Swiss-Prot record:
Residues 414-462 form the AGC-kinase C-terminal domain. Residues 1-15 are annotated as: Interaction with calmodulin. It holds the Pfam family Pkinase. SUPFAM superfamilies: Protein kinase-like (PK-like), Regulator of G-protein signaling, RGS. GO terms for molecular function: ATP binding; beta-adrenergic receptor kinase activity; G protein-coupled receptor kinase activity; phospholipid binding; protein kinase activity; protein kinase C binding; protein serine/threonine kinase activity. It is found in: Cytoplasm; Nucleus; Cell membrane. Residues 162-413 form the Protein kinase domain. The gene is GRK5. Belongs to the protein kinase superfamily. AGC Ser/Thr protein kinase family. GPRK subfamily. Changing K358A: Nuclear exclusion. This is G protein-coupled receptor kinase 5. CDD domains: STKc_GRK5. Its EC number is 2.7.11.16.
Length: 490
């Protein structure tokens, strides 16, 4: 699906074009060698050229597989990593760990296999690469190649960059996205500038496997567009009621709740509250994984502060929202409660699927009545649901200081290995079939703040998935400088 002319659209600029980038990009190890997908691959590639640095990239790779290794094979996988990297006579012996630190890792291995056994070692390796290896890479041809990729990333994004099928496709890469087309005229009479910008900022700032990500924010003569993750597996409401009993088995509900909890955690790391947690806002992708969508009612809370707002949907409003009180992140754990209850039982905890009730009785129920459970719930499921549905937001699960960690420890997730879930190692319970189908200048300033262009991490991830990186990222034969990286002849 790539425009036949793409090799030229994404043609590397000559390295002499990138001096202003070299001078301004902040040289931070974590950002350039890990957080940014293309910088991580280029630093890894640099370490492969030097021999003494090769073994450190292999070790970190094997430690990554150890953390997600099944609990039974932890003791087994531990020995491998040990006898390969942490034995002085090994060929790939990671040396900068220190003799005093390898001797401690021999004890934790003769004791109990914990998924964090090599966490002490992995840090010691990173603190070595933070030093000399990083600064050589910064003067290497691989950082010059990173600057070229950054130059492409920052190129202007226009309606031409895409191909509307709403669901836009990037022409140069073939990547498929869903685009939210916001008509300009309807945003100004309604005073929606602050809300459209507050939503664009939340979308781009959270990078989460379980929340729709922003990849582009451009302007057209006829709208202001948001380009987001595409989701074709349908929404959770459709699967609870049309594809379910009305409802799911507990184990199936557990998987979705675990992914929804991780999504809420990624939002709360940016101290952003969601407030819109309802089944039809949980979407499935093509693989059966979910993401939280529709952040229009989201808002960033300043650390240490509260907010007001009676917003959301009837039935899915926490009692502190219905009473219009100063609240924090607590409405989202009330919403997780409603979601787990509704997945298991097949109806909201305060409104029967077959009840004809008014908005008012629903609200009275949310504030006074204690939801009742059935045999579809295990004791652990009853526990987590009625703790997330604690009306007093001060005694509600996760609304304390520990946060979402207080919820992952709950016995309801006792058989759930989050480390493997966050890594995509667990198979979803349902896989959607592929073929299925489940003019003042003040405006110009708001427009310029919105149309910021391509988002950094999703754009680099797009280049890697579509194999544009693999094919374009080529150097000279035998460690030589390609023409685009040689200043002697532009």
């Amino acid at each position: 699906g790539k425009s036949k002319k793409w090799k030229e659209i994404l043609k590397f600029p000559h390295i002499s074009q990138c001096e202003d980038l070299r001078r301004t990009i902040d040289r931070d190890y974590c950002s350039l060698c890990d957080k940014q997908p293309i910088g991580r691959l280029l630093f890894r590639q640099f370490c492969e050229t030097r021999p003494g640095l090769e073994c450190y990239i292999q070790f970190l790779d094997s430690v990554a597989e150890y953390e997600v290794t099944p609990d039974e094979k932890l003791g087994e996988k531990g020995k491998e990593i040990m006898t390969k990297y942490l034995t002085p006579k090994s060929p790939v012996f990671i040396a900068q760990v220190g003799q005093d630190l390898v001797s401690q890792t021999e004890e934790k291995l003769l004791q109990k296999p914990c998924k964090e056994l090599f966490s002490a070692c992995a840090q010691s390796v990173h603190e070595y690469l933070r030093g000399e290896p990083f600064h050589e890479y910064l003067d290497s041809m691989f950082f010059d190649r990173f600057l070229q990729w950054k130059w492409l990333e920052r190129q202007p994004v226009t309606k031409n960059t895409f191909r509307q099928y709403c669901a836009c496709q990037v022409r140069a890469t073939g990547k498929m996205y869903a685009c939210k087309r916001l008509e300009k005229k309807r945003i100004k009479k309604r005073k929606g500038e602050s809300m459209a910008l507050n939503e664009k900022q939340i979308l781009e700032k959270v990078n989460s496997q379980f929340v729709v990500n922003l990849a582009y924010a451009y302007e057209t003569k006829d709208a202001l567009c948001l380009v987001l993750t595409i989701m074709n597996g349908g929404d959770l409401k459709f699967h609870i009621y049309n594809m379910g009993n009305p409802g799911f088995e507990e184990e199936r509900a557990l998987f979705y709740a675990a992914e929804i909890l991780c999504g809420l955690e990624d939002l709360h790391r940016e101290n952003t509250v969601y407030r819109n947690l309802k089944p039809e806002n949980i979407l499935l992708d093509d693989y059966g994984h979910i993401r939280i969508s529709d952040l229009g009612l989201a808002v960033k809370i300043p650390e240490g502060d509260l907010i007001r707002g009676r917003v959301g949907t009837v039935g899915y409003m926490a009692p502190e929202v219905l009473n219009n009180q100063r609240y924090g992140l607590s409405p989202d754990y009330w919403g997780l409660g409603c979601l787990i209850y509704e997945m298991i039982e097949g109806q909201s905890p305060f409104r029967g699927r077959k009840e004809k009730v008014k908005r008012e009785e629903v609200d009275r129920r949310v504030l006074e009545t204690e939801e009742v459970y059935s045999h579809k719930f295990s004791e652990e499921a009853k526990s987590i649901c009625k703790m997330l549905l604690t009306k007093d937001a001060k005694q509600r699960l996760g609304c304390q200081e520990e946060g979402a960690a207080e919820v992952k420890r709950h016995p309801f997730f006792r058989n759930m290995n989050f480390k493997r879930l966050e890594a995509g190692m667990l198979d979803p319970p349902f896989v959607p079939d592929p073929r299925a189908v489940y003019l003042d200048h003040t405006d110009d300033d708001f427009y310029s703040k919105f149309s910021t262009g391509s988002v950094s991490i999703p754009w680099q991830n797009e280049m890697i998935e579509t194999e544009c990186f693999k094919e374009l990222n080529v150097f000279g034969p035998n460690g030589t400088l390609p023409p685009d990286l040689n200043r002697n002849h532009p």
